[PDB]
């Protein structure tokens, strides 16, 4: 938010990123303020105590501007990033069905040419990632794999997509290709992510290669030492089953 106050007030990017910063806090009242901010964004698109003081004042301004849901459902999907922000606000706040509706409305535009774009804008790709996340909670995975294969054919560096396909492989017990794509993800990440490192170490543990698991967990800790559940779930068993 300290950086966000550097943005022009009239800029659309500031207006949507303000809602993003408010929804980041995960606070339900902040979620409501962000939701109303995003609804205002889509409607408008259709047609050192001083720094803390500024932070507080912008928080109050968002609160009072928060004091239109059918407008999202019915209007033309002209502003995609605001649609994505609204959808993730709906998902975090708890309403999964409305998030499904709004994001399906966003991605019925192109569903592909849009992903194959060599552009800085990646809102469409992030929408694909969110759709994979939502489908992973539905009990079905075939359409999630469909989306992941699409985005990875378009974008080979999508480390999160590799992570998700590895995870659904782990559900399918297909562990060799899961480990292969996890190694792909680990290479792309440059060994600097706690979650793909965590699951890679767990796969090594299940694969019975505790030296590799120790290497992965040591990289996780030398980069993100505060990640929980890493040592007590991987390192202890790797030490225990290093020499059976």
């Amino acid at each position: 938010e300290q950086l966000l106050l550097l943005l022009p007030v009239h800029s659309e990017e500031r207006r949507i990123l303000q809602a993003y910063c408010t929804m980041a806090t995960r606070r339900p009242e902040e979620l409501e303020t962000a939701l109303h901010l995003f609804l205002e964004c889509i409607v408008a698109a259709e047609t050192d105590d001083e720094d803390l003081q500024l932070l507080a004042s912008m928080h109050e301004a968002a609160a009072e501007l928060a004091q239109t849901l059918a407008f999202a459902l019915q209007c033309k999907v002209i502003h995609p990033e605001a649609f994505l922000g609204l959808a993730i606000c709906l998902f975090i706040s708890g309403q999964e069905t409305a998030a499904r509706n709004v994001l399906a409305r966003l991605l019925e535009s192109k569903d592909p040419i849009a992903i194959l774009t060599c552009s800085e804008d990646d809102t469409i790709e992030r929408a694909m990632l969110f759709e994979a996340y939502m489908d992973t909670q539905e009990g079905r995975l075939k359409d999630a794999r469909f989306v992941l294969q699409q985005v990875l054919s378009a974008n080979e560096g999508c480390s999160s997509a590799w992570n998700e396909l590895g995870l659904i492989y782990e559900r399918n017990q297909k562990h060799k290709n899961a480990s292969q794509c996890y190694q792909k993800a680990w290479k792309l990440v440059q060994e600097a992510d706690p979650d793909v490192g965590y699951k890679l170490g767990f796969n090594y543990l299940r694969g019975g290669q505790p030296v590799k698991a120790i290497d992965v967990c040591k990289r996780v800790l030398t980069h993100h030492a505060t990640y929980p559940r890493i040592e007590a779930d991987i390192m202890d068993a790797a030490y225990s089953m290093l020499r059976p």
Binding site: Q2, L3, L5, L6, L7, P8, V9, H10, S11, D48, E50, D51, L54, P194, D195, H224, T226, Y227, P228, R229
Partner: protein, 75 residues
């Protein structure tokens, strides 16, 4: 479970970026960014300058600036 990486503080990225404070008041109404392309990156401190030591420091800094690129060996 949720985990958020520890990223550097804004003042860690630059020590003399106090304009971050100043620019956060004027922008309360609209954008004046064409006036703010003039603020110096650093700021002067309260020190004393010996002529010979200052010249030696300037020469050493320019030599280090040259040698930082010269370490790659590109020519």
């Amino acid at each position: 479970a949720g985990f958020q990486a520890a990223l550097p503080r804004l003042n860690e990225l630059d020590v003399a970026n106090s304009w971050d404070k100043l620019l956060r008041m004027m922008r309360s109404e609209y954008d004046m960014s064409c006036l703010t392309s003039c603020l110096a990156r650093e700021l002067d401190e309260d020190v004393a300058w010996n002529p010979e030591m200052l010249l030696v420091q300037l020469t050493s800094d320019m030599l280090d600036a040259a040698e930082l690129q010269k370490d790659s060996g590109e020519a």
